[PDB]
Design a protein around this nucleic acid. Structure first.
Ligand SMILES: [Mg+2]
Ligand SMILES: [Mg+2]
Ligand SMILES: [Mg+2]
Ligand SMILES: [Mg+2]
Ligand SMILES: [Mg+2]
Ligand SMILES: [Mg+2]
Ligand SMILES: [Mg+2]
Ligand SMILES: [Mg+2]
Ligand SMILES: [Mg+2]
Ligand SMILES: [Mg+2]
Lengths: 204, 59, 122, 117, 137
RNA sequence: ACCUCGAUGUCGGCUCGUCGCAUCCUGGGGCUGAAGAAGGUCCCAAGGGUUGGGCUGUUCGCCCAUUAAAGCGGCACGCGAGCUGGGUUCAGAACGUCGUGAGACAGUUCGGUCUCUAUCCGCCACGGGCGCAGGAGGCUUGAGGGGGGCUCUUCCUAGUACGAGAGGACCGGAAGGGACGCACCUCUGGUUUCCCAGCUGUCCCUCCAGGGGCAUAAGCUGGGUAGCCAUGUGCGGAAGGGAUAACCGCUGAAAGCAUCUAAGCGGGAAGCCCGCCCCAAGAUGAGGCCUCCCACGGCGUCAAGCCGGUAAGGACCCGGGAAGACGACCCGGUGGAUGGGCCGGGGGUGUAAGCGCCGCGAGGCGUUGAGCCGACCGGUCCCAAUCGUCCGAGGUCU
């Protein structure tokens, strides 16, 4: 399964034959090979990639040793991607021809503590008629003595966001070998400037 | 006299185990550039002053 | 976007002049109906001695919408009303004339006979 | 949730905007001023803007300082006495320093806002 | 990194400029390509520009046209690759940005609220014609 | 009638689901009084879905328009420490009926107070301690768990098979919809509490001009960046792999014939399990990998630890964040762009004040697309994270 590391800059639209394709733009070029994973010594095949260079202003962590063990230069953060064994060098978006389908994995926008509606698209209740104190309340969680308890997995008020949200089957519009860019069908998660990883779409 | 209600008088450990998360973090502090005083981070000590912003008190 | 209980206007010489939707003909549990869609309406207002009189149960096609129309060419288009043309199981309109602009959207839906007699297509 | 743009606040709008207007008077009349940290952290900005308009030479600016300061003898001071001391300075026209103490019967933190000099 | 917004602009090779200028409060016509069933037309569509939503590349404008007794509005994007010709016809004083009242109050009462911004007229009438002599020599 | 006479509040509706299968639709199969499609009948199977209204308290039911179908049932006729008082069988009042009555009705009508403080279990989320046989940084595997699974229409093959016409296909492939779900802001469309302007009345600065307060907790109105959302956008269900249910066969004996089974083999459903997405090593079974750090100063006479300064690292403090209720998570801390200021771009409002010209005038015209400015995108050390404090290993046994 292919893979590449990118970061979100936003989204606009191009035009195709005679229609407007909403896109989103991502910087994903300079991802260098770091540490691979051997089915002999690690248990699988996977290639570590780092992104976003950064002058060593705290990286005195052993991570400095990680980059010397592969001639790499200090990157901001650095993640893996499985079933992707390319050539021990630098992988860019130029492996993505204007046609392939992609699978993006980014972060979710954090929406703080959540209301049960907002969180699970309930209905809350009426604006009137009675009680007032139930305009966005849950409304009934159980039965009575039978079963007596409250189920697990019960949708209740909590926390929405800050999760890994993978989207699938976005198609590449164009690609930029000059300034290292990637474009797909638009709806990509994450805030405009955050973790976001791209890889080939599961299919055939 | 109203709605939900404790059922059984909460026991001692019961009452007390909740209260572990209640002990106070003692105040953190540094010593003044000039004074031999003890003083918070990013502060101006109630005796000295500074070197770009006064405080200078009196006798 | 057209939901049940929604007085549409009437854009053809069929006779009627104002009708209220009953259900959208686009699926089972479906919500709205933009242009180019067929609805079941009840003629709630109609010219005397027409071809469709008041209190009837008609089948009409929507050619307008106060909602917008994100045409896939980016462009958008909207009107100041909601208007339908009364048709039939045979689809072909029952009036002998249509007035008012009709969206391009209909022409794609095989409703050729209306954009043919269209006074202006948009 | 909120706070994806940016602001600090408490109490309603008019009270908030008028409070920002009372400090400037209480600032430009003294200099060394002691209020609360967040009331100060938001007071730096509302000041420099006015200070920066006053560095400009345009009676337009005055009425825009009068818009927040209803007293000329509080602003004619600001112009021909304060603004020159900040010429050749592209900003920064307000220092703010955390204090150390904290008032009784309140436990709130305190800080100092002296016009940088 | 610190080019975060230049990136989009770099992606804007689809940028035109033969568009003449204008601003809300005047009438104009475009010319547009529609899949005309079997083919494609130049649908000249003349009306009043109502709203202008600017955002660099994807800046849109909304045109309103009263056709055959029906108040219509039409929303177009500025850099749309479908605008063959586009030429103004008249200009008018603004007083306000948007104008969602020509919706409700559409009549002669707009023939007095528009009024001829004759200032830009001379401006338009200047470089349009007096600068033609700055070509033929 | 055993339970509750110190409340079992006796029908629905709102939301919230869950389970059952005797199945409503989709799927698989047999027989058919099955030409074909279509239908009937039954065998397997919960995966998903099962619309919106009219009528009255109603669930029940008839109806409207659709529809792949508009399934039945349990969960205290599910659900008032969630809502609903709507009625029901309080006190008021009237109609009918019984007694001469006082009242009464398993008859009727109108009106009629539902308890802020969650102690324990349960649940949705988030943290501190500890443990993970030394300590720390970063990156992963997947036992285990959860979520979604729906479905119509059209078309080519071909108006070919079939039938005498009408009608009219199986298998395969293509395109378009409905809802539901996850994310997003580019466009569409909402908000945006003082970002911009217009307006009234009044009171102020200072008389004119210009400007501020109050008329909300905005005075009202017109437009609205960022941000957050749906009506708007992108995507998803699937393909595919294996084993199965109903059913269909091959080989073949008991039983010189037959038989799908008794040894054995194949085909076979949206259903089972992998594949898809998400959590996840508290997986006391506590993993795997890369890297960085490294002894004992002295007590505890043998012990497990102790009273102190460290390493790699971390916290504290600060400036902060599309992160967030605290806490937690992440960026920055003078080698830095983290906040505020300032510059510029985008944008928003739409010709500022002043002056001059014109008009007896309210006003208009040129300076003018001027003036002002919250988030957006970048820049600039001007102010502020300056200075420093605290924690923390010295590696058990065959
Ligand atoms: Mg509501
Ligand atoms: Mg025509
Ligand atoms: Mg804030
Ligand atoms: Mg207060
Ligand atoms: Mg007020
Ligand atoms: Mg026969
Ligand atoms: Mg099922
Ligand atoms: Mg918007
Ligand atoms: Mg109030
Ligand atoms: Mg879909």
């Amino acid at each position: 399964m292919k893979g590449i590391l990118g970061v979100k800059v936003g989204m606009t639209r191009i035009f195709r034959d005679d229609r407007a394709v909403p896109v989103t733009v991502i910087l994903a070029g300079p991802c260098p090979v770091v540490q691979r994973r051997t089915p002999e010594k690690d248990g699988y095949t996977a290639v570590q990639l780092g992104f976003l260079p950064q002058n060593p202003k705290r990286v005195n962590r052993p991570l400095k040793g990680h980059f010397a063990k592969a001639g790499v230069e200090p990157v901001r953060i650095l993640r893996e991607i499985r079933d992707f064994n390319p050539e021990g060098d630098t992988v860019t978006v130029e492996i993505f021809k204007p046609g392939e389908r992609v699978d993006v994995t980014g972060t979710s926008k954090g929406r703080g503590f959540a209301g049960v509606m907002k969180r699970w698209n309930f209905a809350g209740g009426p604006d009137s008629h009675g009680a007032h104190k139930i305009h966005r309340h849950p409304g009934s969680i159980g039965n009575r003595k039978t079963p007596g308890r409250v189920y697990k997995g019960k949708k209740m008020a909590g926390h929405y966001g800050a999760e890994r949200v993978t989207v699938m089957n976005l198609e590449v519009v164009d690609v930029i070998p000059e300034e290292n860019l990637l474009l797909v069908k638009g709806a990509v998660p994450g805030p405009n400037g955050g973790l976001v990883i791209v890889r080939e779409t599961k299919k055939a | 006299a109203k709605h939900p209600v404790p059922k059984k008088k909460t026991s001692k450990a019961r009452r007390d185990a909740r209260r572990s998360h209640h002990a106070l973090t003692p105040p953190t502090l540094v010593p003044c550039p000039e004074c031999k005083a003890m003083k918070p981070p990013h502060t101006v000590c109630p005796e000295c002053g500074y070197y770009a912003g006064r405080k200078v008190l009196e006798v | 976007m057209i939901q049940p209980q929604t007085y549409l206007e009437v854009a053809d010489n069929t006779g009627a002049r104002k009708i209220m939707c009953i259900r959208v003909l686009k699926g089972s549990n479906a919500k709205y109906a933009t242009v180019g869609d067929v609805i079941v309406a009840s003629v709630k207002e109609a010219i005397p001695r027409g071809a469709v009189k008041e209190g009837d149960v008609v089948k009409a096609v929507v050619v307008r919408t106060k909602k917008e129309v994100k045409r896939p060419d980016g462009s958008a288009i909207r009107f100041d009303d909601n208007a339908a043309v009364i048709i039939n199981n045979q689809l072909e309109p029952r009036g002998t004339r249509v007035f008012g602009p009709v969206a391009r959207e209909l022409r794609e839906k095989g409703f050729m006979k209306i954009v043919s007699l269209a006074p202006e297509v948009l | 949730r909120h706070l994806k743009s940016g602001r600090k606040l408490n109490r309603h709008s008019s009270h908030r905007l008028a409070l920002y207007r009372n400090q400037a008077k209480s600032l430009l009349t003294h200099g060394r001023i002691t209020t609360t940290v967040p009331k100060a952290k938001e007071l730096r900005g509302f000041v420099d803007h006015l200070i920066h308009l006053a560095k400009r030479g345009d009676l337009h600016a005055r009425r825009l300082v009068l818009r927040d300061l209803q007293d000329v003898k509080l602003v004619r001071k600001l112009f021909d006495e304060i603004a020159p001391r900040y010429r050749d300075r592209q900003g920064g026209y307000t220092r703010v320093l955390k204090l150390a103490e904290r008032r009784r019967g309140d436990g709130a933190p305190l800080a100092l806002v002296e016009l940088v000099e | 990194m610190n080019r975060g917004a230049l990136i989009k602009l770099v992606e804007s090779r689809y940028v035109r400029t033969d568009l003449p200028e204008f601003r809300p409060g005047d009438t104009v016509r475009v010319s547009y390509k529609v899949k005309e069933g079997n083919r494609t037309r130049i649908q000249d569509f003349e009306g009043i520009v109502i709203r202008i939503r600017r955002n660099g590349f994807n800046t849109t404008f909304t045109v309103r046209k009263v056709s055959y007794g029906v108040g219509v509005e039409r929303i177009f994007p500025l850099h749309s690759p479908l605008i063959q010709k586009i030429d103004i016809v008249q200009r008018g004083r603004a007083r306000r940005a948007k104008l969602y009242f020509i919706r409700n109050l559409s009549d002669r009462e707009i023939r007095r609220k528009l009024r001829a911004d004759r200032k830009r007229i001379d401006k338009d009438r200047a470089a349009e014609r007096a600068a033609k002599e700055e070509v033929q020599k």
